[PDB]
Amino acid sequence: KWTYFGPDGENSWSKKYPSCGGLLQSPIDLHSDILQYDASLTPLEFQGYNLSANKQFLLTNNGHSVKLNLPSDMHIQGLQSRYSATQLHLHWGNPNDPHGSEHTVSGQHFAAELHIVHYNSDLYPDASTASNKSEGLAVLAVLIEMGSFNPSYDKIFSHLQHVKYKGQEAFVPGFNIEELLPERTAEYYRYRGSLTTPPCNPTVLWTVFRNPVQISQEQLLALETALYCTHMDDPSPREMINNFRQVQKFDERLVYTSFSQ
Amino acid sequence: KWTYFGPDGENSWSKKYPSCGGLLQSPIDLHSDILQYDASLTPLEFQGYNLSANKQFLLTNNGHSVKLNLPSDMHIQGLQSRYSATQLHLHWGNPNDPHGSEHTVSGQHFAAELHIVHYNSDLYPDASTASNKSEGLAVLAVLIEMGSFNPSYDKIFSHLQHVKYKGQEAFVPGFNIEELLPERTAEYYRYRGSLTTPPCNPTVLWTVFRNPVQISQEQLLALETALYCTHMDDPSPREMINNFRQVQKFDERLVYTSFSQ
Ligand SMILES: COC(=O)c1cc(S(N)(=O)=O)c(Cl)cc1SC1CCCCC1
Ligand SMILES: COC(=O)c1cc(S(N)(=O)=O)c(Cl)cc1SC1CCCCC1
Ligand SMILES: [Zn+2]
Ligand SMILES: [Zn+2]
């Protein structure tokens, strides 16, 4: 039901989803006053990200984003439990304003944002169970700027016309998900926060990479014009655009950085 | 009951104040891509701003800001209707993150923000009646940054000691409120928006001056540290900090400017 625009938009989410008005909300603006270097933030290792090109993975329009299902053998090594992948998805703006990242850096939006959602598979048997438990989820966020054409992101974007409407599903051949990450993944921001969508559970360990990746203007325009929040037969179609939450107050949180300067 | 933090903070305002989740919400980021010069935007005239030094004006801590009551002979000339003053108040951050303006410019907060609230006295008998009506309110916003000591702002800040707690009141002798305005008041941003606090009625014509004023490090710290949201005999005192709303989405809309250069 919830949306990003109009009466069911973000200032109203808390009416139906109490955690959206709770503590530890994401996303946030990353700026100097709230950053602090933490030398304990060692490099993550990305295991099983190189999905077999002979296997296929389900892409689905869920009414709010486009998501790709990921296999539980794919995981992050380096956190205090193993976190296994469950899905990736994006957030973006619109053709006339391609500035739809969720996190901002010193007050500025990037064009888009990729989230790769993982869950604590050591403790929980699936991501839904994990999603309402403390530090049950770990999301990796990649900031996306308008730049060069990106063939790795196009392995997703080339299938958008086959998931235009809510409920639609398509198969994507496997590819190396690490190709979606930026340079120098050892440099990141780390903070305790929440799902950026209803039900906004405050159960996410966030890692936002310091460096953005680039996709082209034409890739952003495809992403911003391919998809609808509504079903194929809905008489009141709604374009899937501007699907990012505004930044949240940082109720006395610090953001820890793995880089000093 | 509403606050800027915890369960009753800004994401939950729309439960009891539905307009907080409606159209035309303020504040917004004033950024270059949405600015448009409008030659119709002529200089306002500030009439009756030189308050009789022989009258006294009520300063209150209302639990959300510090407000000074203003007299209805003080008014703006230059708009469609006369808008008569009713009150002024401020918004600020906190000493660890001293960047608590409501409006932002190109994504950047200023240290604080002063609002001089006026109502349409040609159409309505008083500010309360005007506040939920068409063309009801006009607010002048001054952005504040740290710099040199500002004697005129000290005409308010010297009384903060006396209104530390919710409910408390002091009297301030009349002074020239135009002294709180920045240089080159002819230069401003103008847009239709809302109260930035509950009930968030979309009835405000905003005028945000282009140029900030300065107050000293000591004055900004006094403002951030002088006040509490709670009553004097509350066993759980809360400091009055970070009393600004996050910026709202503003799509397919312009902010008009009285300046091009
Ligand atoms: C429309 O987006 C979602 O619904 C969704 C978004 C995020 S985000 N944007 O990365 O904070 C996360 Cl961590 C989980 C979910 S859904 C969650 C996925 C794990 C299983 C439980 C449902
Ligand atoms: C705590 O701040 C307020 O309550 C308040 C704030 C604003 S703002 N921040 O300038 O948008 C305005 Cl326009 C009116 C009011 S109260 C309004 C004053 C006119 C009579 C009705 C009540
Ligand atoms: Zn997301
Ligand atoms: Zn105000």
Numbering used by the authors:
A (entry chain B), B (entry chain A): 3 to 263
What do the authors of the reporting publication say about this deposited model?
The carbonic anhydrase (CA) family (CA, EC 4.2.1.1), consisting of twelve catalytically active human isozymes, performs the catalysis of reversible hydration of CO2 into bicarbonate and acid protons. Since it has been observed that CAIX isozyme is highly overexpressed in numerous cancers, it has been postulated that compounds inhibiting CAIX may possess the anticancer activity and may be used in tumor treatment. Here we have designed a series of compounds, methyl 5-sulfamoyl-benzoates, which bear a primary sulfonamide group, a well-known marker of CA inhibitors, and determined their affinities for all twelve CA isozymes. Eight crystal structures of CA complexes with compounds are presented in this study: 9a bound to CAI and CAII, 3b, 3d, 5b, and 9a bound to CAXII, 3b bound to CAIX and mimic-CAIX (mutant of CAII containing amino acids in the active site as in CAIX: A65S, N67Q, I91L, F130V, V134L, and L203A).
We divided the compounds bound to CAXII into pairs according to their similar binding affinity. Compounds 5b and EA3-3 in the active site of CAXII were compared in Figure 3C. The 5b is well defined in the crystal structure. The binding affinities of the two compounds for CAXII differed by a factor of 2.5, which is insignificant: Kd_intr = 0.020 nM, ΔGintr = −63.5 kJ/mol (5b) and Kd_intr = 0.0080 nM, ΔGintr = −66.0 kJ/mol (EA3-3). These compounds differ structurally by meta-substituents; EA3-3 has a longer and more flexible substituent (-NH(CH2)2OH), but both meta- groups were mostly exposed to the solvent, so they did not contribute much to the positioning in the active site. In addition, the para-cyclooctyl groups of both compounds occupied the same position. Since the chlorinated compounds had less freedom in the active site, the differences in entropy and enthalpy of the slightly different binding of the meta- groups compensated each other: ΔHintr = −43.6 kJ/mol, -TΔSintr = −19.9 kJ/mol (5b) ΔHintr = −39.5 kJ/mol, -TΔSintr = −26.5 kJ/mol (EA3-3). The transition from 1 to 3b and 5b shows different changes in affinity and selectivity; compound 3b bound distinctly more strongly to CAIX (−17.5 kJ/mol), CAXII (-11.4 kJ/mol), whereas compound 5b bound more strongly to CAI (−12.6 kJ/mol), CAVB (−13.3 kJ/mol) and CAXII (−12.6 kJ/mol). Therefore, regardless of the compound, all ortho-compounds occupied a similar position in CAIX and CAXII, and para- occupied another but similar position to each other in CAII and CAXII (respectively).
